[PDB]
Write an enzyme that holds these catalytic residues in place. Structure first.
Site, short mmCIF file in Angstrom:
data_model
loop_
_atom_site.label_atom_id
_atom_site.label_comp_id
_atom_site.label_asym_id
_atom_site.label_seq_id
_atom_site.Cartn_x
_atom_site.Cartn_y
_atom_site.Cartn_z
N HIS A 18 30.93 61.88 81.26
CA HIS A 18 32.10 61.40 81.99
C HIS A 18 31.73 60.46 83.12
CE1 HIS A 18 34.95 62.23 85.51
NE2 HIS A 18 35.58 61.39 84.72
N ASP A 28 34.34 25.41 81.08
CA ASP A 28 33.68 26.62 80.62
C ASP A 28 32.46 26.91 81.49
OD1 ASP A 28 31.93 24.61 79.67
OD2 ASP A 28 31.28 25.90 78.01
N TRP A 53 24.42 62.77 86.15
CA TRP A 53 24.41 61.31 86.18
C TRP A 53 23.07 60.79 86.68
CZ3 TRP A 53 26.31 58.91 91.20
CH2 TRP A 53 26.10 57.53 91.21
N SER A 83 22.74 43.19 80.38
CA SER A 83 24.02 42.49 80.37
C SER A 83 24.46 42.10 81.77
CB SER A 83 25.08 43.36 79.70
OG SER A 83 26.38 42.86 79.97
N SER A 84 24.34 43.03 82.72
CA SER A 84 24.76 42.75 84.09
C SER A 84 23.91 41.64 84.71
CB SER A 84 24.68 44.01 84.94
OG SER A 84 25.66 44.95 84.52
N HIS A 106 23.13 52.96 96.11
CA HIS A 106 24.13 52.54 97.09
C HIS A 106 24.66 51.14 96.86
CE1 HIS A 106 26.26 53.93 100.59
NE2 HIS A 106 26.18 52.71 101.09
N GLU A 145 25.07 49.87 94.03
CA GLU A 145 25.92 50.04 92.86
C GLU A 145 27.35 50.37 93.27
OE1 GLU A 145 25.86 49.69 89.72
OE2 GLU A 145 27.84 50.60 89.46
N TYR A 194 28.88 49.66 95.85
CA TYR A 194 29.57 48.54 96.46
C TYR A 194 29.95 47.48 95.43
CZ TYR A 194 29.07 50.07 101.25
OH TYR A 194 29.18 50.76 102.44
N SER A 233 43.61 40.65 98.42
CA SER A 233 43.91 39.51 99.28
C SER A 233 44.96 38.61 98.64
CB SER A 233 42.65 38.72 99.58
OG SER A 233 41.75 39.50 100.36
N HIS A 251 20.66 58.42 102.86
CA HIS A 251 21.63 59.44 103.23
C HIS A 251 22.08 60.26 102.03
CE1 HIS A 251 24.19 55.67 102.74
NE2 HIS A 251 24.62 56.45 101.76
N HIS A 252 21.72 59.85 100.82
CA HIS A 252 21.91 60.70 99.66
C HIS A 252 20.89 61.83 99.61
CE1 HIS A 252 23.41 56.67 98.85
NE2 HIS A 252 24.29 57.20 98.02
N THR A 280 34.31 46.68 107.62
CA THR A 280 35.46 47.04 106.79
C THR A 280 36.73 47.17 107.62
OG1 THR A 280 33.88 48.28 105.45
CG2 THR A 280 36.22 48.52 104.94
N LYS A 302 38.42 43.80 107.72
CA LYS A 302 39.22 43.49 106.55
C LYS A 302 40.54 44.25 106.56
CE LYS A 302 37.38 42.46 102.72
NZ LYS A 302 37.35 40.98 102.84
N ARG A 329 28.48 72.29 93.83
CA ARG A 329 28.76 71.35 92.75
C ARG A 329 28.10 71.80 91.45
NH1 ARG A 329 27.02 65.49 94.70
NH2 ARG A 329 27.91 64.92 92.67
#
Ligand code: HEA
Ligand SMILES: CCCCCCCCCCCCCCCCCCCC(=O)O[C@H](COC(=O)CCCCCCCCCCCCCC)COP(=O)(O)OCCN
Ligand SMILES: NCCc1c[nH]cn1
Ligand code: CUA
Ligand SMILES: [Cu+2]
Ligand SMILES: [Zn+2]
Lengths: 117, 48, 56, 124, 268, 535, 236, 58, 363, 100
Positions: free
Chosen positions: F64, F94, F129, F159-160, F243, F245, F247, F258, F292-293, F318, F321, F440
């Site tokens: 999942h 293109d 995960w 791919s990324s 981390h 990731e 973001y 926006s 911090h993880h 943040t 924004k 958890r």
């Protein structure tokens, strides 16, 4: 595949941009090997003619309906972006003038027309 | 042939089998695949 | 006179920023004087009574 | 008079070839000095340009908020009925019974536990 | 844009690539490689002649991409002054990503170098593991790489002054100076006394000098494809975007080798 | 044969985005049904659906997480909204490397097969995960399961990376006549900023997973503490990717909001340069904080202090924004269309999801909230209610321009309200369960945590019905969608102003600040023949 | 202490460290509630006043004094929060004279406890193993998935230092009320300290994932008086 | 002719009427083996990935 | 505490470096005055103390930045470019001296010195402006001042909220006579000479050779900063095992070779590598030479760290003081490739002198 | 930065040079979007501009904007007592007298 060009006055397509051949025992130059959209640029920069323009639009005078700014376009439409007469006062507004109607720019008021080439 | 039904990989009008079947089957398979795995792993370890 | 109005939006901004802060401080001065302090007092009074039994 | 009178109930039904004739007849009738215009023409001129038709209609009418509300209710009453079926058919362990959750309270009372806010293991 | 007949030619200097079938085929080859390698290591296959087909097909697909990339630049003639700049930026952004897989391995060597665990007696290269002497064959490799760095700049300065014999010799010598590096580093894996599993020192020493080997076979292939494409008159005196990329790849690998020799072979 | 040369051997960038969307729907339906399988077993104490198998429960959690972090949010936010809209907004025909785009798409369907085949060929891969080293070995998971799951993180990474390189190369040398790098729209800036982090983060994760594979299969002894290694190394080599990731999934969303706040509130964005600088700062300060993880592994007392300071500093950008969005909505006129409702639901729920993050960055307070449902309740508000809402808003915003068919407004509103109620009912009590001490990754729990677990299992059945209503909304969009533009004035892109007459409005209808909403109803395959002009 | 059925807030404390943690959390919640109330009020004002309005102020777009006031105000909040956090981080630890040592080794799916003191000349050191009592064998009144057969016993008002390791996989020693949460990695020794102020029974569970039976691994700590501890230690 | 066929294959790839990867009279030798072996490799990874789900080993 | 001096030195070097590159003869006016300030500070720390000159010299940068921000006239800008020399000299000398004083172990000193000197070439990268033209430049340097304050609170609370000797000697005149001190000074000075001459003259030659664009000019020289960072950080911990003289010699050789190889390149891609090599070699030289100076003063003198690091900072600042004008004068007179060749062979020939520092004699 | 006495001159000049209805409505729409309510002199020019272009709905919709711009109701009734001779000469009727 046909007669070769010598300047950009004798170029009627992609059939005039093949070029002669280099000789055995030498490193060939770019006037002896270039076919596609690369030899057009080479033939343009050897004279002073730039084939691909990069000049922004006119930001000196406004536009009235009697005297509209004429944008040149090879199609029936061209997207034109207006930022004002001082050229950075108005925010950016995009317009699509057509050969049947004129753009008018809701904020400042400049009108644009098409010259179909 | 540019128009409103021209950039889609699938056909939506003038079709033999109605579009409802292909649309329903997609979501059915999507929401039914993650139960087959559970069934397989439950039947591979004794429990029912 | 009554035919000369110049600034009205700025007063609205100042009234909406000086009321979203007083209201916020109101809802934050209740978490620290009605939800936290009495719990600390109750906890301390429990420990100043479990010790007197041991002393006796 | 009939062409202009009561345009508030007929504009949206007329075709687009009878709408450009009324507009093209009020643009050669406004060039005359005002105070020579009948009241019906004044009402029509206001309705045609600034009026609640065409691109000036509301996003939500009165008969659409009811539809949204009574769709959300029928979407919350179905999940409740589906979750009810999965609640009668549960595996209830032996521990979750009242006569078992009152014996744990005596043990948690003998060994003083949760002197503060509370101890209670009874939830039927 | 007021030249007489300008509508008969494209109005902007960019490439509109024709439809090609290679992206799908490379993906189908990678799927087979992934599944077959993930299965073959745990049974379920038996014979090891399938993984070799997968690898061979992946490399063949890459070569068949490069064929269509070279027929669109030297014969058809669609590489203006914009597309070449785009290709250069792309190669830079790939080399940069290729440099950051080495930083991770270096950080996995400094995280165990300074502070070694209790299990190994606290000492780098540990007892019972003799390291590789840094005054032996691991120095002839450095001399060969520095020589190859200079033998390739003599080839790039002979295609600009219009000397053909003088661009074939330099490339040949450079190609023969990366084969001796590979030979030297294949006889230093046969005369060694520590395997991959006898320490954490043999697991990171064979994992930073083994990626270099794979990265350096590509240099031999790229230099062969640059000599064979110069023997047949494909390169002009100002339009050669294959030499420049194969020279920006040799210098980076030389700089990387000059860090795997001071942090792996001297420091201990 | 014309089918094969336009949908299998393709070069056009806008015909691949549709394939991304059709893949994202499937890979987001699979994960959602797997989530319902989880929430149906954590309903009342005991062993209810999965009879006694604690394996097949951790497998469901891993499958999942992977299906919706790598197969739903990234493809939707980089493929359907990045590939399709960036070239049109910058004025290019293109992309620069089209074949790389085609391979970037086609590497994913071969990657779903490996993940689906890592859950059937044995007991499974119940490592979570984050595949921690000493559990994902050959002693607890012994079979072709973890190996076939680590090969699904290599193809996606390829791919990324290949997409990020293309995005950075297209935005630098394929702009129009007068578009410098200060007049780009905000979405292109967001994609560039995310594409730089994708280059600077992925290789570390690739190295870590490859080293794990070598340790599993070629007895290399990297993370075995019986030969001179430490498992903690893997954690470092994972969280450098961890981390950035999280973001990458959120920066593309922000830009979309926006545009919405600029459209239905007829006002320009307050301080665009401020927004671009804030996005840059958020991107840069996301690489210097990855520990911090891992607060309870035994770090020093002078390293926790740096990592508590370097995490709270992200709140400063943040806030800029958020406050700029409020300033944009303040003065202008607001009409409540479907995208603006989703925009409003993102400025409040994201704040609730992020304000909890300043309670978890403290090193002192992390000994009570680590490995607890508080973290779960944290990241659902910012993932399930921060990314999915943005994706829905983007779909409802740009779907009529891409397809040319409109959608029923009432059903969209019903779906939005159901999703709102369900997600706000399912993720809130997890805060209480975490505060009271529920760990958890446990199928069965003590009798005390029953009650709230019966309330968080009720919202999921409300959200899945929202998904089904979404399916019917798409069906009503595709069939009889041409005659759904006269039902409501939600169709109109901009409402006429106070003095603007209707007759003048019908002549001059579209007023925009980008090339996006001026193109034809379905965009032409070749959109720009002659270059666009900007002052 | 034991979890409560419909819990909303922290469990009761029995150590100064958990009290400091609670005080710090309740200090941060102040500023968090203030900021949330401000944002919600501005959204309410926007919805109530400017919703479908005739006048659009399309010329207020720059700001200069206001943009310095949402970049300096939030910084002060962070500094104010960070003062007590740093004080708590550096202050609270085992500064002086630890008084006991208990090694808690975490095997696959049970626990092993060893008492490093009480050593005879031959190595008689007291040790035992803690398992979970299954549901079928529970007596009347015991807790499900939290009750053990052997439980740790410690005195009140005595510093206890826990040394935690592991033998198979990565575990987590967690007793919520006491504020103890450290990992157990296979190749290192971690340590913490705890002081118990009142007598009772204190329950806890594992945190980090270890495999199939991760949910059956409780921890049970009793805080007996010194006389009872001396009697119990002379029986095992 | 001489080694400069470059001015003769540039009149061929333009005006070809076939895709650029199958225009020269040599692409058969490259494209037949590749497409032939690809359909064997992709049919050998789907017989052992369905045979492994059933528990059968070799 | 120990962390506070590290943080103060890092911040001071960062601020000086990022104020040196404000976009805004004048440049060479900052270093030379700083040179005149260098010895004097070395005296003050012997008597007055470290922290007093540290603060009185850390505040001068703030007054100078205000001077830069508000004034625009030529004399005002000249005053602004001045007062950076004095403040920078005081801050750097005092910070490095007190860092040497606080850390007494040799390996710890090397590690801390490397990490601290990593600040230079970081300020150029972390924020190149400081209070630039647009207001939003106080929207990018705003998140970093907060981090600086949040990290300084840790040093503050740890030292004066928690757990709670003078000597004289080392005359400067006597210290100047010691050959090893002069060897270290020249070792720093020539490596500084190289980059000082290389930096300004590169763009002119690039325009002459290839018509370099504005963005390419900036992008070409950037990798030297990253090379400096990596080299300093790595060798601050790696140099002790191999002996610092070997690292210094290898750095000198590599920097000479890299500077020599520059003229041969005919493209920016070729220019990328040599700049990285030069940065790495300069990091070598700095990280190896800075710690050894305190070791020498401990071995052969009494423990005072003022005058010796004053000499070191004079060595650093002489490079930027003279060499831009000298490089320009040599340019257009003999040629850029000739200039790089001369500097390369000079640096290489200086290499054998590093053998003396391996085993200095006892006191 | 602009003052009242410059706003109320620049917009008069703009209103004295509109030549069609599109321009008249453009100038009116960008005038009612500031912090300053327009002065009675500017609105006097706006009505003459609406008379030259020959439009009626715009002359009535202008008076319907002052009701929304003005803060209170006394100011609205004070704007309608200085703009009264302009109304009773042209012939403009307010919306609340028509009941549209
Ligand atoms: C995708 C969404 C997302 C985002 C954007 C982020 C970014 C942030 N995350 Fe990240 N985070 C996750 C989801 C996300 N995270 C996940 C899933 C994990 C790992 C879970 C796992 O591995 O099991 C993780 C990792 C993680 C952890 C580790 C938890 C642990 O294991 O101990 C923590 C807290 O410690 C945290 C909090 C934050 C914060 C504060 C932000 C910040 O970006 C948010 C800041 C936002 C605000 C603060 C809004 C501010 C509003 C204003 C009005 C400003 C006011 C000013 C102040 C309040 C001073 N995140
Ligand atoms: C991981 C490494 C991936 C490397 C990809 C190539 C890196 C350079 C990219 C580049 O600029 O050149 C491309 C060629 O690459 C290629 O032809 C090979 C790219 C695909 C390699 C195989 C991918 C396996 C993963 C252009 O490709 P182009 O044809 O679009 O340029 C249009 C032609 N004018
Ligand atoms: N002259 C500042 C650039 C630099 C020098 N050293 C490292 N970086
Ligand atoms: Cu054992 Cu967790
Ligand atoms: Cu995080
Ligand atoms: Zn305009």
């Amino acid at each position: 595949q046909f007669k070769t060009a010598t300047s950009i006055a004798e170029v009627e397509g992609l059939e005039n941009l093949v070029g002669p051949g280099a000789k055995t025992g030498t490193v060939p130059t770019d006037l002896e090997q270039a076919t596609g959209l690369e030899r057009y640029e080479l033939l343009g920069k050897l004279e002073g003619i730039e084939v691909f323009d990069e000049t922004p639009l006119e930001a000196v005078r406004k536009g009235t309906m009697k005297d509209p700014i004429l944008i040149d376009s090879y199609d029936d439409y061209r997207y034109v972006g207006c930022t004002g007469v001082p050229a950075d006062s108005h925010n950016i507004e995009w317009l699509k003038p057509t050969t049947e109607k004129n753009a008018r720019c809701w904020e400042c008021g400049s009108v644009y027309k098409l010259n179909f080439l | 042939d540019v128009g409103p039904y021209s950039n889609l990989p699938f056909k939506v009008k003038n079709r033999r089998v109605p579009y409802a079947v292909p649309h329903f089957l997609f979501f059915a398979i999507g929401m039914g695949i993650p139960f087959f795995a559970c069934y397989v792993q439950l039947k591979r370890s004794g429990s029912i | 006179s009554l035919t000369r109005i110049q600034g009205s939006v700025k007063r609205r901004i100042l009234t909406d920023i000086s009321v979203g802060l007083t209201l916020g401080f109101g809802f934050a001065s209740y978490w620290w004087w009605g939800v936290h302090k009495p719990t600390v007092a109750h906890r301390e009074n429990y420990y100043i009574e479990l010790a007197k039994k041991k002393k006796a | 008079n009939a062409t202009v009178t009561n345009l508030e109930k007929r504009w949206e039904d007329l075709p687009e070839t009878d709408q450009k004739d009324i507009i093209s007849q009020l643009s050669e009738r406004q060039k005359l000095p005002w105070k020579d215009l009948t009241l019906s023409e004044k009402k029509a001129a206001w309705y045609i340009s600034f009026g609640e038709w065409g691109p000036r209609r509301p996003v939500h009418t009165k008969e659409d908020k009811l539809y949204i509300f009574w769709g959300t209710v029928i979407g919350i009453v179905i999940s409740a009925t589906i979750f009810g079926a999965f609640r009668y058919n549960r595996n209830v362990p032996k521990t979750m019974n009242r006569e078992w959750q009152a014996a744990s309270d005596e043990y948690l009372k003998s060994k003083n536990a949760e002197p503060f806010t509370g101890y209670s293991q009874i939830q039927s | 844009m007021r030249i007489q007949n300008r509508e008969n030619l494209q109005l902007f200097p960019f490439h509109l690539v024709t439809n090609s079938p290679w992206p799908l085929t490379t993906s189908l080859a990678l799927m087979s490689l992934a599944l077959t390698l993930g299965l073959t290591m745990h049974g379920y296959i038996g014979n090891h002649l399938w993984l070799f087909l997968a690898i061979s097909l992946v490399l063949s697909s890459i070569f068949l991409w490069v064929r269509d990339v070279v027929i669109e630049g030297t014969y058809l003639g669609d590489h203006t002054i914009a597309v070449r700049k785009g290709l250069n930026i792309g190669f830079m952004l790939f080399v940069l990503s290729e440099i950051l897989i080495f930083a991770a391995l270096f950080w996995s060597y400094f995280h165990s170098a300074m502070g070694p665990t209790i299990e190994i007696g606290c000492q780098w290269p540990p007892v019972g593991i003799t390291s590789i002497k840094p005054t032996e064959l691991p120095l002839l490799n450095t001399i060969i790489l520095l020589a190859s760095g200079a033998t390739v700049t003599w080839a790039h300065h002979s295609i600009l002054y219009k000397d053909r014999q003088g661009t074939l010799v330099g490339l040949f010598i450079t190609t023969l100076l990366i084969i001796l590096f590979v030979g030297c580093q294949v006889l230093e894996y046969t005369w060694a006394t520590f395997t991959i599993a006898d320490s954490v020192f043999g697991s990171i020493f064979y994992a930073g000098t083994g990626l270099h080997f794979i990265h350096m076979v590509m240099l031999i292939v790229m230099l062969a494809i640059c000599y064979a494409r110069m023997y047949f008159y494909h390169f002009t005196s100002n339009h050669h975007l294959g030499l420049e990329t194969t020279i920006l790849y040799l210098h980076v690998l030389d700089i990387i080798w000059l860090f795997l020799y001071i942090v792996f072979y001297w420091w201990g | 044969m014309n089918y094969i040369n336009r949908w299998l051997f393709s070069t056009n960038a806008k015909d691949i985005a549709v394939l991304y969307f059709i893949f994202a729907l499937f890979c987001g339906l699979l994960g959602s049904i797997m989530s319902l399988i989880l929430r149906l077993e954590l309903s009342a104490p005991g062993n209810q659906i999965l009879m006694g198998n604690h394996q097949l429960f951790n497998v469901v959690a891993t499958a999942h997480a992977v299906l919706m972090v790598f197969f739903l949010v990234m493809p939707a936010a980089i493929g359907f909204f990045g590939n399709y809209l960036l070239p049109l907004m910058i004025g290019a025909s293109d992309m620069s490397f089209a074949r790389l785009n085609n391979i970037s798409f086609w590497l994913l369907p071969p990657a779903l097969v490996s993940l689906l085949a890592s859950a059937l060929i044995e007991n499974g891969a119940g490592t979570g995960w984050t595949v921690y080293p000493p559990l994902a070995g050959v002693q607890s998971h012994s079979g072709p399961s973890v190996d076939l799951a680590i090969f699904a993180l290599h193809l996606t990474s390829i791919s990324s990376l290949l997409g990020a390189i293309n995005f950075i190369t297209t935005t630098l040398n394929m702009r129009t006549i007068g578009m410098t790098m200060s007049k780009l729209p905000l979405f292109v800036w967001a994609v560039v900023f995310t594409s730089i982090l994708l280059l600077l983060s992925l290789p570390v994760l690739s190295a870590g997973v490859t080293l794990l594979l070598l340790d599993r299969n070629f007895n290399t002894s990297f993370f075995e503490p019986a030969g001179g290694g430490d498992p903690i190394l893997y954690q470092h080599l994972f969280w450098f990717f961890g981390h950035p990731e999280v973001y990458i999934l959120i920066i593309p969303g922000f830009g979309i909001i926006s545009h919405i706040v600029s459209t239905y509130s007829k006002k320009p964005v307050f301080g665009a340069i401020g927004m671009v600088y804030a996005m840059g700062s958020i991107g840069f300060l996301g690489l210097l904080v990855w520990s911090h993880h891992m607060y309870t592994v035994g770090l020093d007392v002078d390293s926790r202090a740096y990592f508590t300071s370097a995490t709270m500093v992200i709140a400063v950008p943040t806030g800029i924004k958020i406050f700029s969005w409020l300033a944009t909505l303040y003065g202008g006129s607001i009409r409540y269309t479907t995208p603006m409702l989703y925009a409003f639901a993102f400025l409040f729920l994201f704040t609730v999801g992020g304000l909890s993050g300043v309670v978890l960055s403290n090193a002192s307070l992390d000994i009570a909230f680590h490995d607890t449902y508080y973290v779960i309740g944290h990241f659902h508000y910012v993932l399930s209610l921060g990314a999915v809402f943005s994706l829905f808003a983007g779909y409802y915003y740009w779907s009529p321009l891409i397809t040319g068919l409109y959608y029923n407004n009432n059903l969209a509103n019903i779906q939005f309200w159901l999703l709102f109620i369900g997600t706000n009912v399912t993720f809130f009590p997890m805060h209480f369960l975490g505060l009271n001490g529920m760990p958890r990754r446990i199928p069965d729990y003590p009798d005390a945590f029953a009650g709230w677990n019966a309330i968080s299992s009720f919202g999921s059945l409300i959200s899945i019905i929202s998904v089904i209503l979404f399916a019917y909304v798409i069906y009503d969009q595709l069939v009889n969608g041409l005659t759904n533009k006269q039902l409501s004035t939600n169709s109109l892109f901009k409402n006429p102003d106070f003095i603007e007459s209707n007759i003048i409005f019908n002549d001059n209808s579209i007023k925009s600040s980008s090339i996006d909403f001026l193109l034809t109803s379905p965009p032409l395959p070749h959109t720009f023949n002659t270059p666009a002009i900007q002052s | 202490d034991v979890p409560t059925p419909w819990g909303i807030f922290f469990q009761d404390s029995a150590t100064p460290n958990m009290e400091g943690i609670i005080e710090l959390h309740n200090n941060i919640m102040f500023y968090l509630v203030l900021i949330l109330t401000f944002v919600s009020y501005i959204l309410y004002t926007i919805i109530y006043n400017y919703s479908n309005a005739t006048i659009v102020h399309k010329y207020m777009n720059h700001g200069q004094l206001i943009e310095i006031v949402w970049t300096t105000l939030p910084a002060v909040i962070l500094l104010i929060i960070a003062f007590p956090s740093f004080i708590l981080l550096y202050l609270c630890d085992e500064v002086i004279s630890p008084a006991m040592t208990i090694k808690a080794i975490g095997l696959q799916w049970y626990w092993k406890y060893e008492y490093s003191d009480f050593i005879n000349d031959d190595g008689e050191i007291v040790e035992f193993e803690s398992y979970v009592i299954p549901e079928e064998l529970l007596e009347d009144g015991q807790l499900r998935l939290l009750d053990v057969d052997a439980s740790v016993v410690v005195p009140v008002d005595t510093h206890i230092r826990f040394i935690v390791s592991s033998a198979d996989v990565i575990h987590d020693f967690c007793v919520p009320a006491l504020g103890v949460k450290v990992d157990a990695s296979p190749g290192r020794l971690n340590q913490t300290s705890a002081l118990i102020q009142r007598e009772g029974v204190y329950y806890g569970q594992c945190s980090e994932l270890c495999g199939v039976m991760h949910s059956a691994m409780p921890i049970k700590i009793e805080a007996v008086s010194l006389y009872e501890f001396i009697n119990w230690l002379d029986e095992q | 002719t001489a080694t400069e066929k470059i001015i003769e294959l540039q009149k061929f790839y333009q005006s070809t009427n076939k895709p650029i990867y199958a225009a020269h009279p040599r692409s058969k030798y490259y494209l037949i083996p590749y497409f032939g072996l690809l359909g064997v490799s992709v049919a050998a990874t789907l017989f052992y990935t369905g045979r492994a789900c059933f528990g059968i080993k070799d | 505490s120990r962390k506070l001096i590290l943080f103060i030195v890092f911040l001071a070097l960062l601020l000086d470096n990022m104020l040196l590159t404000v976009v805004v003869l004048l440049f060479a006016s900052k270093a030379t005055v700083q040179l005149i300030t260098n010895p004097f500070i070395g005296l003050l720390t012997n008597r007055i103390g470290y922290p007093i000159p540290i603060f009185a010299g850390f505040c001068i940068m703030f007054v100078s930045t205000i001077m830069f921000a508000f004034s625009s006239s030529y004399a005002f800008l000249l005053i602004a470019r001045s007062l950076q020399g004095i403040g920078s000299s005081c801050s750097s000398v005092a910070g490095m001296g007190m860092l040497a004083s606080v850390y007494t172990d040799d390996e710890e000193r090397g590690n801390v010195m490397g990490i601290a000197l990593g600040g230079l070439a970081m300020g150029v990268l972390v924020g190149p402006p400081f209070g630039s033209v647009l207001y939003e430049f106080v929207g990018k340097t705003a998140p970093f001042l907060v981090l600086a304050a949040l990290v300084l609170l840790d040093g503050a609370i740890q030292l004066f909220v928690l757990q709670p000797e003078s000597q004289k000697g080392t005359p400067l005149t006597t210290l100047l006579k010691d050959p090893y001190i002069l060897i270290a000074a020249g070792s720093i000075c020539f490596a500084n000479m190289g980059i000082a001459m290389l930096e300004p003259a590169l763009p002119i030659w690039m325009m002459e050779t290839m018509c370099s664009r504005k963005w390419q000019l900036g992008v070409a020289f950037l990798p030297a900063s990253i090379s400096y960072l990596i080299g300093t950080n790595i060798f601050g911990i790696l140099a002790h095992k191999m002996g610092r003289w070997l690292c210094a010699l290898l750095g000198m050789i590599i920097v000479g070779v890299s500077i020599l190889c520059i003229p041969f390149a005919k493209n920016i891609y070729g220019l990328i590598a040599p700049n990285f090599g030069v940065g790495f070699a300069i990091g070598m030289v700095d990280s190896s030479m800075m710690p050894i100076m305190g070791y020498l003063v401990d071995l052969r003198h009494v423990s005072v760290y003022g005058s010796v690091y004053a000499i070191a900072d004079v060595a650093f600042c002489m490079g930027y003081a003279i060499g831009p004008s000298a490089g320009g004068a040599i340019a257009k007179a003999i040629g850029f490739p000739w200039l790089m060749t001369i500097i390369g062979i000079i640096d290489i020939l200086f290499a054998p002198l590093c053998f003396f520092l391996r085993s200095p004699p006892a006191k | 930065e602009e003052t009242y006495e410059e706003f109320s001159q620049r917009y008069e000049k703009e209103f004295d040079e509109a030549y069609d209805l599109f321009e008249v409505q453009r100038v009116l729409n960008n005038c009612f979007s500031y912090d300053i309510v327009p002065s009675p002199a500017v609105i006097g020019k706006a009505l003459n501009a609406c008379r030259r272009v020959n439009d009626y709905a715009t002359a009535v919709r202008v008076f319907e904007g002052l009701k929304h711009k003005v803060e209170t109701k006394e100011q609205y009734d004070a704007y309608l007592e200085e703009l009264k001779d302009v109304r009773e000469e042209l012939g403009i009727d307010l919306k609340e007298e028509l009941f549209p």
